[PDB]
């Protein structure tokens, strides 16, 4: 569209996990307490 | 692979965000003089039978 | 090391015939180097990109 492009090869598909560390432990699952009342 | 094409020989003027311009190859000639249709042409007979 | 990135806004005024112009934006941080964040000043890995 009025701009001339240059041919190129397909690039390596990457996601977030390629570059950045997941700082969540896969060994220790901290559990949470129930409750839906605000005074409680 | 960007496939090969044949040049369309039309005006390639773009006017920005309005897209491609309106191509008017012959202007008003074909509206006054009349449609030409150069694709079909007749070779006039210069010779003949005697 | 520093990687200088150019960032640009192509602003073409709607309905105006002026040339579409490219404007370098956000060149306070894209032009200066990173900084050891004060949250975690110890490791380089905590120096976060602008």
Automatic annotation (TrEMBL), chain C:
Full-sequence range covered: 894 to 943 of 1240
Naturally occurring in which organism (per UniProt): Rosellinia necatrix megabirnavirus 1 (isolate -/Japan/W779/2001)
Domain of life: Viruses
Protein name: Coat protein
